[PDB]
Amino acid sequence: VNIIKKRTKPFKRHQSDRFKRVGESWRKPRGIDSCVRRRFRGTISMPKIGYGNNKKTRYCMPNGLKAFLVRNVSDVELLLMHNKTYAAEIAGNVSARKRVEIVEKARALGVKVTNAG
Template sequence: MAAPADKRKIVKKRMKKFPRFQADRFKRMNPAWRKPRGIDGRVRRRFKGATLMPSIGYGSDKKTRFRLKNGFYKFLVRSPADLEMLLMHNEKYAVEIAHNLGAKKRKEIVERADQLRLHVTNRFGRLRAEENE
């Protein structure tokens, strides 16, 4: 199993939720963020005590953005052939098997990933331990 080449410390800034303004007051209103555009809106004018708006300052460090906690970047795989792309990049990317694959194809992917020394994040999904008889 390969270890990540880059050992940079991953700093996640505040993981803040940004609900839509007044979405808690109306059931029909989706809480997904919408930028306020009204002429009198206190959120748009950034009054003290009002809901905070998302801005660039809440983002993570560019060098470690999208990194997993183990230091790898996630790479979604749907077939064993997709693993060949990661042949030279086993220290940068970790394999994540797509959720809609069956046990047979998952087993093939895990076996091929072991041969290529790739890290698989969801290695044991849908795979039962076979009993030794």
């Protein structure tokens, strides 16, 4: 089954653009005349549960593999069973010596590495 994402653009907090003190992270408004809370025309859209994506295609990359974070080679040995549905992702702090050990091991085990470079 392919992937369809019900929405691509992120959710940005209201007036996040206007102010640097207002973060770019979603907080639900609480004013009783807030046009954003009252969902007027041309206002920003509030996150709802209706936007949730398909269960069979959730936490899936556009190549249909769920990203499993890998710290050492003994974690890649765990993806032995699930090479057809999980993609091994190298942790960002694994040193250069271990990183090549994981990539070579994953190549031998037939486990795709998201950030092999």
